[PDB]
Ligand binder design. Sequence first.
Ligand SMILES: CC(=O)Nc1ccc(-c2cn[nH]c2)c2cccnc12
Length: 112
Amino acid sequence: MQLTPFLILLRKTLEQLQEKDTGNIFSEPVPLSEVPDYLDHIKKPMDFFTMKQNLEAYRYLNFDDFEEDFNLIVSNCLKYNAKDTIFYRAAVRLREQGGAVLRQARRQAEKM
Ligand SMILES: CC(=O)Nc1ccc(-c2cn[nH]c2)c2cccnc12
């Protein structure tokens, strides 16, 4: 596999995942100023902006490491937020809608 088409695919896939986050709940890091206890609960924060930085830093060289950071966005939000919140339900929705984006993207990567 060649690096350039793979990274193009990851860029497109990240854009598609961001489209599913219609409230932009996951676009940027959880603001530690407004959630002071966040790092008490979440060992590795993640968000789509950090994922973009990691992608461009060549930190994602296989689909699993891209998907692992996506799964961190979801799992961190399920962990931190109570089930009766918009935040929790948004992570459930992103897991469902984003999973479908990821499966098709991984098949494209496997054809490379
Ligand atoms: C992605 C996420 O877990 N975000 C957040 C959870 C909880 C809170 C929060 C709820 N109450 N106080 C902070 C957030 C506040 C601002 C921005 N993001 C928040």
